[PDB]
Write a protein that binds this ligand. Sequence first.
Ligand SMILES: *[C@@H]1O[C@H](CO[C@@H]2O[C@@H](C)[C@@H](O)[C@@H](O)[C@@H]2O)[C@@H](O[C@@H]2O[C@H](CO)[C@@H](O[C@@H]3O[C@H](CO[C@H]4O[C@H](CO)[C@@H](O)[C@H](O)[C@@H]4O[C@@H]4O[C@H](CO)[C@@H](O[C@@H]5O[C@H](CO)[C@H](O)[C@H](O)[C@H]5O)[C@H](O)[C@H]4NC(C)=O)[C@@H](O)[C@H](O[C@H]4O[C@H](CO)[C@@H](O)[C@H](O)[C@@H]4O)[C@@H]3O)[C@H](O)[C@H]2NC(C)=O)[C@H](O)[C@H]1NC(C)=O
Ligand SMILES: *[C@@H]1O[C@H](CO[C@@H]2O[C@@H](C)[C@@H](O)[C@@H](O)[C@@H]2O)[C@@H](O[C@@H]2O[C@H](CO)[C@@H](O[C@@H]3O[C@H](CO[C@H]4O[C@H](CO)[C@@H](O)[C@H](O)[C@@H]4O[C@@H]4O[C@H](CO)[C@@H](O[C@@H]5O[C@H](CO)[C@H](O)[C@H](O)[C@H]5O)[C@H](O)[C@H]4NC(C)=O)[C@@H](O)[C@H](O[C@H]4O[C@H](CO)[C@@H](O)[C@H](O)[C@@H]4O)[C@@H]3O)[C@H](O)[C@H]2NC(C)=O)[C@H](O)[C@H]1NC(C)=O
Lengths: 206, 207, 13
Amino acid sequence: GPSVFLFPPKPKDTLEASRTPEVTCVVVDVSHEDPEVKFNWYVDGVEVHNAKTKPREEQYNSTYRVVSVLTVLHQDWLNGKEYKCKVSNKALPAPIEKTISKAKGQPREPQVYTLPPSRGDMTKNQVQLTCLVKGFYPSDIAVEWESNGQPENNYKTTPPVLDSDGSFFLASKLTVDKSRWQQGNVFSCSVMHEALHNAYTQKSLS
Amino acid sequence: GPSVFLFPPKPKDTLMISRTPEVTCVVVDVSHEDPEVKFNWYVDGVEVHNAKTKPREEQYNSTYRVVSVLTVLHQDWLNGKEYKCKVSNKALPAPIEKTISKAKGQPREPQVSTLPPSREEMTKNQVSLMCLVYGFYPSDIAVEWESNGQPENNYKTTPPVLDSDGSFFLYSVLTVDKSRWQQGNVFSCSVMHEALHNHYTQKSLSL
Amino acid sequence: DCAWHLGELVWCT
Ligand SMILES: *[C@@H]1O[C@H](CO[C@@H]2O[C@@H](C)[C@@H](O)[C@@H](O)[C@@H]2O)[C@@H](O[C@@H]2O[C@H](CO)[C@@H](O[C@@H]3O[C@H](CO[C@H]4O[C@H](CO)[C@@H](O)[C@H](O)[C@@H]4O[C@@H]4O[C@H](CO)[C@@H](O[C@@H]5O[C@H](CO)[C@H](O)[C@H](O)[C@H]5O)[C@H](O)[C@H]4NC(C)=O)[C@@H](O)[C@H](O[C@H]4O[C@H](CO)[C@@H](O)[C@H](O)[C@@H]4O)[C@@H]3O)[C@H](O)[C@H]2NC(C)=O)[C@H](O)[C@H]1NC(C)=O
Ligand SMILES: *[C@@H]1O[C@H](CO[C@@H]2O[C@@H](C)[C@@H](O)[C@@H](O)[C@@H]2O)[C@@H](O[C@@H]2O[C@H](CO)[C@@H](O[C@@H]3O[C@H](CO[C@H]4O[C@H](CO)[C@@H](O)[C@H](O)[C@@H]4O[C@@H]4O[C@H](CO)[C@@H](O[C@@H]5O[C@H](CO)[C@H](O)[C@H](O)[C@H]5O)[C@H](O)[C@H]4NC(C)=O)[C@@H](O)[C@H](O[C@H]4O[C@H](CO)[C@@H](O)[C@H](O)[C@@H]4O)[C@@H]3O)[C@H](O)[C@H]2NC(C)=O)[C@H](O)[C@H]1NC(C)=O
């Protein structure tokens, strides 16, 4: 029968007051002969009623993809509230329940450090700028680069790696033209994380 | 019926001439009613006969795990020969054939750069040394740390990330007690990759 | 020449 996948909100959306965080209950392999799906949502056991169903989408393999979305408050999610989606379809013996929440454990502040390019790597058209983010928990984070108010697009970020102390670390690498770095331009590494002061920090290098 | 998974050899095994690389054909979900598995191996479509079957392993979930291992030459793998494992078993409607080889692409030389700890990290009991390895292709690599001949085990290495130029990069972080760094000890990042001279380089770091 | 790693042969050309 149908399968169920329940997704968290994006870290950025939980960490910015302006943004709207949502938990998404995706039901695939819904049959043409029974597309009707009852969703019941529960927040830490208590049933809630403010969920909206996305428009139904046919998949081309003659099954429907039905999606239900629940808006969540920032605090609630960050306070470790569990969200349960109960999916009930007639092609089921019993309903499918799924639960998600933030990862369990004491949150820990990221340590953010900027590292200038190597001296032995200066005979190249472009230089590599480094932002090390270590000592953070949970792994939910966002990392970006900017310069003089403008966002820099030529960067890549590693996914978080579990450290031997039980926190995570990552590195973000910005690639820029050598002349730009030469000219004394300032580049900034911006980090967003629940355990930062105002969920935000910034470090710069030149 | 059974399923097949074909595993490459470890980058270290392929990059060190004093090691022995092998490709591994694992067959899982082999039934108690039909345990017999016929293996045929091919190297660039040419059959080879020097594979060896590992001891049959009971999994305690109704099935067997059956593994055939094929020794391969370093240069064959690195030259990009394709290895094919074909698996036949009575519970199979048709034989299952898998194939692996080194990823296709003109190999590229990793640039290895060392990065001293941030002055702002000098508040903690331990500091972080970085080895940035960028611009390599393929993603098969080995990164390790040493000091005074002895290997340093207190490090973590990111997985390779696809960069905008279609090469890979990674960071390796060695964490040491601050005192060791303060005292002027030398730490080395060792990288092994097919596109380095003799598949090996090393960069050093001290205050 | 040849490359070594912790007293073990890597490669020679
Ligand atoms: C008929 O076809 C359908 C449709 O499939 C598509 O079409 C086919 C032909 C192919 O082209 C496919 O590649 C297409 O997807 C089949 O449906 C698929 O079934 C799969 C399994 O049955 C299922 O795999 C599971 O995926 C999970 C992760 O899914 C992510 O990422 C993938 C890849 O990037 C993406 O395809 C998915 O859509 C999904 O993407 C996320 O969507 C969520 C929900 O919206 C996003 O979160 C929200 O986003 C909004 C923005 O609108 C907003 O930001 C909100 O804040 C936020 O909540 C999220 O951002 C998206 N992520 C990305 C990266 O884009 C895996 O977790 C899961 O693995 C788990 O299950 C297994 C066992 O437990 C284990 O392997 C594993 O350990 C995990 O536990 C599954 O692998 C596919 O997702 C699903 N396709 C779709 C589109 O949903 C169907 O199977 C087929 N019918 C039949 C009968 O086979
Ligand atoms: C009965 O149980 C068995 C056994 O399962 C174990 O026991 C059970 C009870 C549980 O406790 C499990 O936790 C245990 O695993 C079941 O068999 C399993 O079936 C799975 C599929 O159904 C299969 O998943 C596939 O795994 C691939 C990767 O497997 C790796 O990694 C896992 C751990 O993550 C490891 O357990 C596996 O054995 C295997 O490990 C690698 O082995 C190779 C070869 O030995 C190693 O390579 C060699 O290394 C040596 C040195 O040691 C030397 O250098 C050689 O030269 C070199 O070749 C390698 O080092 C090992 N890796 C690691 C990390 O340790 C995935 O690729 C694959 O994914 C792909 O396919 C999926 C779809 O099927 C897709 O989702 C995906 O996109 C990919 O395309 C699968 O996930 C399990 O591996 C397998 N377990 C074992 C032990 O074989 C069996 O199914 C079950 N039966 C029933 C009826 O339930």
